[PDB]
Design a protein around this ligand. Structure first.
Ligand code: 0SW
Lengths: 267, 339
């Protein structure tokens, strides 16, 4: 779906949802009273994986899964983990993202069965009890999500520009599968909230070139781009891979989830 | 859900019934949603607004896509979303726009009932419709439901006589006309075209342009099946029956064999757009006619694009298109009645 494809520089994504890193860290301090910085990053990684598995089970294309992931990050960029249960927010984000596309529809019963099945078969290390929410909870949460996001639903991702860049290189067979997989991995970080997607694409393609010992220095030279920003993004990617190595989500996530601040009931 | 979070958002939430007076001021009653003329309650606002209450409850696929695309689209000739209200209690969605007093359905009906006053009105309308559609098309957004009722025109105010394209068909399953008036439908739709295209929008603009010149729908005519016999009969009565050379890919259309069973070339041998438009006092050697013939091309791949149409020397010929289509002249058209 190529709707608004060349409109990024006048888009709500660009004008409202590229955030300042210090504003983002300031709002995060309220949850850092409960969780360490490392634990908060481990939580955001975990929920990126939850959303990916939900989207895979429902057979959605990667762009839709990416949009749902961006909705989730946008919500928790502004609000505490205690505001709405992230177990409820994740499938709600997938549901809303699926309705922005017109090629088929996710039914109510299929969404709920997917959340129930994915959490039990793939995330039982984190969750001891079955998915407790019914469709009325998803529908209620969707209204809050749409409101917080100021109805900003069209999201731009690095896949499209990556595709153009690898075709420009004439290196689709060699570099595309690896570069694409590194784009997926960047959703385990805050990068999509801080940088335009084309810059993330270039940084992913650079890492792919280094991994595969491919000399593309001359090609990167022919681009008109701030390379300091590209290097910043590369550094976050390399950092994610070191955190990945030191993180065992299966051993740690039940403990980290228990430390999350939890939603307060009424009096 | 956290209780303090919940009551804080409830306390801060803008409700449509608090901000706008609209009860009894319904002006549209379609399937997509009811439209109301609204006035601001708070700031003593002089301006009129349009409130669309979306049909059904929750956020359907069509509601989501309409909100998603309107949130991004910004052009003078495309209707401009000001605000979305989400009413939690009844699960209704309200869309706020600036109010357009007029539209081409009512403007054309007025002329038809009376019998293009300022000499550049038809031209200026056509140019602004092409400009808005071009903006949609350049962003890979199709209208998919173009007709006179969806071409609004602003009344008295800062945007006097400006066209606003509205009621885009934002949701169509698989971009398909085959999924759940035919006067503005391109012949390829009637022969079973499986997807909406830019060309389908351009045909419809052609039909509107003919209707503005004559005051009559050019393809006026009396199931889920896309094939409509009498609508195809009306197109051939006006245009003539297409030669093999005019539309080579007609053979690829799913209903081509049905067309061949039902229709003979001989039936339309003395029919043409030249002859049709001559009967309605439009000159065949006018730049207006030559542009019209480029818009109403039977083969969609031979149909002119919106950008090419905007470049036509018709728009360089006196009178030039104006930003106010009424050209500063007094608007004689009635205001809309409340329902
Ligand atoms: C027949 C033909 C057209 C209509 C238009 C109703 N629709 C509208 N009317 C006035 N302002 C609007 C502003 C934004 C969107 C729709 C509007 C109503 C009846």
């Amino acid at each position: 779906d190529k709707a608004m494809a060349g409109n990024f520089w006048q888009s709500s994504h660009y004008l409202q949802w590229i955030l300042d890193k210090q504003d983002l860290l300031k709002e995060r301090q309220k949850d850092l009273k409960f969780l360490s910085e490392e634990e908060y990053w481990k939580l955001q990684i975990f929920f990126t994986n939850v959303i990916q598995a939900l989207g895979e089970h429902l057979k959605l294309r990667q762009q839709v899964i990416a949009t749902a992931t961006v909705y989730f990050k946008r919500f928790y960029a502004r609000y505490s983990l205690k505001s709405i249960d992230p177990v409820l927010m994740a499938p709600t984000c997938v549901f809303l993202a699926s309705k922005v596309e017109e090629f088929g529809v996710v039914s109510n019963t299929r969404l709920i069965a997917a959340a129930t099945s994915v959490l039990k078969t793939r995330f039982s290390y984190a969750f001891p009890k079955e998915f407790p929410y019914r469709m009325n909870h998803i529908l209620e949460c969707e209204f809050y999500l749409l409101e917080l996001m100021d109805c900003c639903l069209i999201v731009y991702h690095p896949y499209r520009p990556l595709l153009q860049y690898v075709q420009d290189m004439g290196q689709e067979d060699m570099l595309l599968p690896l570069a694409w997989r590194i784009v997926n991995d960047t959703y385990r970080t805050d990068l999509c909230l801080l940088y335009p997607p084309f810059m993330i694409a270039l940084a992913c393609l650079h890492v792919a070139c280094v991994v595969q010992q491919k000399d593309a220095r001359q090609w990167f030279a022919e681009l008109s781009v701030d390379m300091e920003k590209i290097l910043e993004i590369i550094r976050v990617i390399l950092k994610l891979y070191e955190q990945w190595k030191n993180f065992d989500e299966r051993k740690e996530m039940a403990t980290i989830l228990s430390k999350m601040p939890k939603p307060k009931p009424p009096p | 859900m956290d209780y303090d979070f919940k009551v804080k958002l409830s306390s801060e939430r803008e409700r449509v019934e608090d901000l706008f007076e609209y009860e009894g001021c319904k002006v549209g009653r379609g399937t997509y949603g009811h439209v109301y003329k609204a006035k601001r309650k708070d700031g003593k606002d002089d301006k009129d607004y349009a409130l669309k209450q979306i049909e059904g409850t929750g956020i359907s696929m069509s509601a989501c896509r309409e909100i998603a695309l309107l949130r991004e689209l910004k052009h003078p000739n495309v209707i401009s979303l000001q605000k979305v209200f989400l009413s939690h209690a009844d699960r209704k969605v309200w869309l706020l726009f600036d109010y357009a007093e007029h539209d081409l359905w009512h403007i054309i009906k007025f002329h038809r009932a009376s019998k293009q006053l300022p000499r550049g009105m038809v031209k200026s309308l056509l140019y602004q419709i092409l400009d808005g559609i071009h903006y949609l098309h350049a962003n890979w957004v199709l209208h998919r439901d173009l007709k006179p009722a969806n071409i609004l025109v602003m009344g008295e105010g800062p945007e006097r006589g400006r066209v606003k394209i509205a009621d885009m068909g934002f949701a169509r399953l698989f971009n398909s006309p085959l999924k759940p008036t035919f006067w503005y439908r391109a012949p390829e739709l009637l022969l079973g075209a499986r997807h909406y295209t830019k060309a389908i929008d351009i045909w419809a603009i052609g039909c509107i342009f003919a209707e503005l010149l004559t005051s009559e729908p050019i393809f006026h005519c009396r199931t889920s099946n896309p094939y409509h016999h009498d609508q195809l009969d009306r197109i051939f009565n006006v245009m003539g029956f297409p030669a093999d050379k005019d539309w080579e890919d007609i053979k690829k259309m799913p209903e081509h064999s049905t067309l061949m069973k039902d229709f003979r070339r001989n039936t339309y041998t003395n029919c043409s757009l030249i002859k049709y438009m001559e009967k309605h006092k439009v000159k065949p050697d006018s730049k207006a006619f030559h542009l019209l013939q480029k818009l109403l091309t039977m083969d969609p791949i031979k149909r002119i694009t919106s950008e090419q149409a905007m470049q036509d020397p018709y728009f360089l010929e006196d009178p030039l298109p104006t930003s106010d289509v009424f050209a500063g002249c007094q608007i004689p058209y009635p205001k809309r009645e409340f329902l």
